[PDB]
């Protein structure tokens, strides 16, 4: 069945924040479904004859997936989000069984038919779940949230999904409807429903539909259920600037997209829903894609971790080496992003947020221990190494990093230089170094420093033959201990310059320049020692790059001043768009950047042309007959509202 399109209603607006506002016209920017957009009306299953039409369009998740369903029986059950929809990558599974809603994050190996299995039970007369045929695996499960069913119980059902900075948000709302297929033209705010810190990459969306015991049978014939009623709506959210309206109760009564059309742009720039008759300039004639550009120079004062990591010689565990690190910037994700490290476990902090935190003092301790001994290094553990060679506080903060080094720290005769304190009088405290060579007097006999039957040398060394095998192979183990004190911190993570992007008319804020424009290569070379090339004007056509060694041109989005002429919102809905100092042939030059934004190809109407010295005018007819001015357009000729 070919895909179909339907006109999006104004519905889709969700609360951007949990903050409460009353009787306030508040403007916010986020991902949104544009007004009057095209919604792909997936007629998922059609049954006339009992003809199964199994359709599960795996749509690209993109920024935000606006969902709408008219299923009276609520046949649809949850949604599926995943980069690859297999065990290879992490996937999000949402199931809306009646008992509770299941939100479990696992690397599910999804089957070819991703449906919800439910069998009718004769004794209980209940549509209770049979089995989950949607997936086949549950690997590396991370996050689980359980709540009551929200889609469970002629009523329109709407949802918005967004994936931002590893944080998953859901908005929901239900409204009764008497329209068979037309989306009601009513403003329905979508209150926040649940927020999830899933923290995985999601690329494509797939919806889930429950197959009853009729469809559970292998044959195409259905036992007692038909899915012809299945139908829903899908729309893609894009970054948009909105002018929300809050009432006294705080409900979002209405909103206008700054990119919907010139009148809504005038509404946005005037910060009011109702504007009077006249001429007004607008700025948010469309939205800024991607991310605003802010610069920091690439890091120079790196912390000398690699010296500790790549030191030619390491000390034995008993005489473990210690280095203090401060007054530098350190990257840990780079260490995390290395398969050369066999063991990378953190305690008291997440490896992902490691670059986010600051510490006054960071102590790195390294030594050599054989493979099976790496377990004891973890905080709160027990064992000979933990007790007599090195111990960590139970409240330790930091990470333990290890890797095999049989290639380097072993020889044909085996390395005996690496040593472990086998015997000691008492268990070591955390952060305690013992280097005493005094003979261990296990027995009561005072040996006076002479080896005997009950007197043992406290120290013992590995053989480290290369063929002993992993678990006996040397592991160069480095322990990162972070000291968190009420002192001005020194160690801090790196600052990211967002890599580099090109040809996007977005905000440039090179170390806080606070400008707007499109990124293009600059052939002109400004003064090099400046971080950014300085123009005679405050706004600089070309901005030098602190990160790289380059200068990049910038260009504003609206080279023409978007002056919109329209009567009062009470008066009429007609619009008049004037591009000041722009020829009607340069109106297509504007239309290029405008048509980069969707539906502005349709907008500016059909670009019906009337040229004035002040600028080319589109959206009105020139009045040949002389008349008194209605709106001071310019050049002594004005147009008025009429039938």
């Amino acid at each position: 069945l070919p895909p179909a399109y339907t006109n999006s209603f104004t519905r889709g607006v969700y609360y951007p924040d949990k903050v409460f506002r009353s009787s306030v016209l508040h403007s916010t920017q986020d991902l949104f479904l544009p007004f009057f957009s095209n919604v792909t009306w997936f007629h998922a299953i059609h049954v006339s004859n009992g003809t199964k039409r199994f359709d599960n369009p795996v749509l690209p998740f993109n920024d935000g997936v606006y969902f709408a369903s008219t299923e009276k029986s609520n046949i649809i059950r949850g949604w599926i989000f995943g980069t690859t929809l297999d065990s290879k990558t992490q996937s999000l599974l949402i199931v809306n069984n009646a008992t509770n809603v299941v939100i479990k994050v696992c690397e599910f190996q999804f089957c070819n038919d991703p449906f919800l299995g439910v069998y009718y039970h004769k004794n209980n007369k209940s549509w209770m779940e049979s089995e989950f045929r949607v997936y086949s695996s549950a690997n590396n499960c991370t996050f689980e949230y359980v709540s009551q069913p929200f889609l469970m119980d002629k009523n329109l059902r709407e949802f918005v999904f967004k994936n931002i900075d590893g944080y998953f948000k859901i908005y929901s709302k239900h409204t009764p409807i008497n329209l068979v297929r037309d989306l009601p033209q009513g403003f329905s705010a979508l209150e926040p429903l649940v927020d999830l810190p899933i923290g995985i990459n999601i690329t494509r969306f797939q919806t889930l539909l429950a197959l009853h015991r009729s469809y559970l049978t292998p044959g195409d014939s259905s036992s007692g259920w038909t899915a012809g009623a299945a139908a829903y709506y899908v729309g893609y959210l894009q970054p948009r600037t909105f002018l929300l309206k809050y009432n006294e109760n705080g409900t979002i009564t209405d909103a206008v997209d700054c990119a919907l059309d010139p009148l809504s742009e005038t509404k946005c720039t005037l910060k009011s829903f109702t504007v009077e008759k006249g001429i007004y300039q607008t700025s948010n004639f469309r939205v800024q894609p991607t991310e605003s550009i802010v610069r920091f120079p690439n890091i120079t004062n790196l912390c000398p971790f690699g010296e500790v990591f790549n030191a030619t010689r390491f000390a034995s565990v008993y005489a473990w080496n210690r280095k203090r690190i401060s007054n530098c910037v350190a990257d840990y994700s780079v260490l995390y992003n290395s398969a050369s490290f066999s063991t990378f476990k953190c305690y008291g902090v997440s490896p992902t947020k490691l670059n986010d935190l600051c510490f006054t003092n960071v102590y790195a301790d390294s030594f050599v221990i054989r493979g099976d001994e790496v377990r004891q290094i973890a905080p709160g553990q027990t064992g000979k190494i933990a007790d007599y060679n090195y111990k960590l506080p139970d409240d330790f903060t930091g990470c333990v990093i290890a890797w095999n080094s049989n290639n380097l720290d072993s020889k044909v005769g085996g390395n005996y230089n690496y040593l472990y304190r086998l015997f000691r009088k008492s268990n070591l405290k955390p952060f305690e170094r013992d280097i005493s060579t005094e003979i261990y007097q296990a027995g009561s006999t005072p040996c006076n420093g002479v080896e005997g039957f009950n007197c043992y040398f406290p120290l013992q060394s590995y053989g480290f033959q290369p063929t002993n095998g992993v678990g006996y192979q040397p592991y160069r183990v480095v322990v990162l201990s972070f000291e968190l004190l009420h002192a001005p911190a020194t160690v801090c993570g790196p600052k990211k310059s967002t890599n580099l992007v090109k040809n996007k008319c977005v905000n440039f804020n090179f170390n806080g320049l606070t400008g707007t424009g499109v990124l293009t290569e600059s052939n002109k070379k400004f003064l090099p020692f400046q971080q950014f090339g300085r123009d005679i004007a405050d706004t600089t056509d070309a901005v030098r790059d602190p990160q790289t060694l380059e200068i990049l041109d910038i260009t504003p989005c609206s080279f023409g001043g978007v002056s919109v002429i329209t009567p009062g919102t009470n008066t009429s809905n007609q619009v008049a768009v004037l591009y000041q100092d722009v020829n009607c042939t340069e109106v297509p030059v504007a239309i290029h950047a405008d048509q980069l934004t969707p539906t502005w190809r349709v907008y500016s109407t059909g670009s019906n042309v009337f040229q004035t010295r002040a600028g080319c005018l589109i959206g009105a007819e020139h009045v040949n007959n002389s008349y008194e001015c209605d709106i001071p357009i310019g050049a002594g000729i004005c147009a008025s509202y009429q039938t």
């Epitope: 600051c358 006054t360 903060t397 002192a487």
Partner: antibody, heavy 118, light 108 residues
Framework: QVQLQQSGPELVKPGASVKISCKAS????????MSWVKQRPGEGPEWIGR????????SSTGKFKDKATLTADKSSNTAYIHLSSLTSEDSAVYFC???????????WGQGTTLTVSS | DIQMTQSPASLSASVGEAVTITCRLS??????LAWYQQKQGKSPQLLVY???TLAEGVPSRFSGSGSGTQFSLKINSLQPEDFGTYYC?????????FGGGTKLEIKR
């Protein structure tokens, strides 16, 4: 021994730009981060950003990225926060607080109430 | 973003009683939370950062506890000056978020 003082409360027309001055004493200005926190009346305060004077670096959240720009003068140990496009929603009380880099705040200035109205 | 939940929202107790205020966070922050006391018209004052670490110049009556999602601020003995509003705030990195606000009233 750690004293933090801010300028008096300011009345500004909506849509304009305002600057708030915070003064620090009794400790090295450069070594310790100085931040800003904005509190709506009858509502919990919110973090704004941080500035670290010796290099002039400033980090802030996207919500106030356009609104707030952090500038710190090492000479007078006085860091000025600049707010622009003032709205009625923006009008609230603002505090400057010393930070040892851990985003927890041991000292706090008396605060300045910002009022936005016609 | 990060969600702050405080229970109870409002609490009242008499002098010398034991009061516990609970904080709940969406994500797991291991130990990087800070407790602040606020009085009307005043600046906030730091009470407990980390979990058990009392701030400088804080009466020994105040105590912090909890790990991960659950964080508890416990007052062993209430005092007349302890009245005010109490906030729980993570400092696990940008952006720090303050709590909704817990009202404490000294009963008499």
């Amino acid at each position: 021994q750690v004293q933090l003082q801010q300028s008096g409360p300011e009345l500004v027309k909506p849509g304009a730009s305002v600057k708030i001055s915070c003064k620090a004493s009794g400790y090295v200005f450069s070594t310790s981060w100085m931040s800003w926190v904005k509190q709506r009346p009858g509502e919990g305060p919110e973090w704004i950003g941080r500035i670290y004077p010796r290099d002039g670096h400033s980090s802030s959240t996207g919500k106030f990225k356009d609104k707030a720009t952090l500038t710190a003068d090492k000479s007078s140990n006085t860091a000025y926060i600049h707010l622009s496009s003032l709205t009625s929603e923006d009008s609230a009380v603002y505090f400057c607080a010393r930070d040892y880099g851990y985003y927890y705040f041991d000292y706090w200035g008396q605060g300045t109430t910002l009022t936005v109205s016609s | 973003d990060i969600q702050m939940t405080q229970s109870p929202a409002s609490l009242s107790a008499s002098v010398g009683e034991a009061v516990t205020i609970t904080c709940r966070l969406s994500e797991n922050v291991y130990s990087f939370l800070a407790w602040y006391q606020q009085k009307q018209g005043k600046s906030p004052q730091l009470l407990v950062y980390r979990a058990k670490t009392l701030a400088e110049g804080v009466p020994s009556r105040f105590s912090g506890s909890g790990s991960g999602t659950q964080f508890s601020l416990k007052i062993n003995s209430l005092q007349p000056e302890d009245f005010g509003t109490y906030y729980c705030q993570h400092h696990y990195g940008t952006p720090p978020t303050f709590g909704g606000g817990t009202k404490l009233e000294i009963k008499r």
